[PDB]
Amino acid sequence: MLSGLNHLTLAVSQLAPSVAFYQQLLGMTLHARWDSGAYLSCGDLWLCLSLDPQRRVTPPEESDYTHYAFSISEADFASFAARLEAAGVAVWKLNRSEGASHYFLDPDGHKLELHVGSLAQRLAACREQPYKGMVFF
């Protein structure tokens, strides 16, 4: 029986600028770095950055909607999004609205998101404005 996410591994093209992005800009905790990777944490999340020469920097218009969202509180959301914009972090666009979210790209074009709210809150919101064809179990 599966119990949750054990770790998320992102392939990166250059290790140093990616470590700087996740640690210095996003504030994640750096535990270890070596010649081909780094281990960080964000609360319960174990994030691994893995140096991969096959990673290409892809424009958001030509990558799919696969994305990774991080939790932030209502009180910090707007000021954090503002800090990312002031630092020149690029944005991307999703096809639909899923609540209070800010969409931004990492240096390799991984699609990231800041989101306020839990799954339970999302389901309650969707009961009032559902997506087309929505069924609840």
Ligand X SMILES: CCNC(=O)CSc1nnc(C(C)C)o1
> What does the binding site for Mn ion look like in residue numbers (CB under 5 A)?
9, 69, 113
Nearer residue to a copy of itself within complex by CB, 2 or 88: 2
Is residue 84 involved in binding a copy of itself (CB under 8 A)?
no
**Cα dihedral 103, 104, 108, 109 in deg (nearest 10):** 40
Neighbours of 75 (CB within 10 A): 8
Question: What is the Cα–Cα distance from 122 to 40, expressed in whole angstroms?
Answer: 28
Question: What is the Cα–Cα distance from 34 to 32, expressed in whole angstroms?
Answer: 7
Size of the site for ligand X (CB under 6 A): 9
Name the one range near ligand X by CB under 6 A: 13-21, 40-48, 59-67, 123-131: 40-48
Q: How far is the CB of 14 from a copy of itself (least distance, A)?
A: 13
Question: How do strand 45-51 and strand 101-105 relate by DSSP bridges?
Answer: unpaired
Is residue 60 involved in binding a copy of itself (CB under 8 A)?
no
Nearer residue to a copy of itself within complex by CB, 2 or 86: 2
Question: What is the Cα–Cα distance from 63 to 115, expressed in whole angstroms?
Answer: 21
Is residue 3 involved in binding a copy of itself (CB under 8 A)?
yes
Q: Which residues in the 99-128 window bind ligand X by CB under 6 A?
A: 117-119
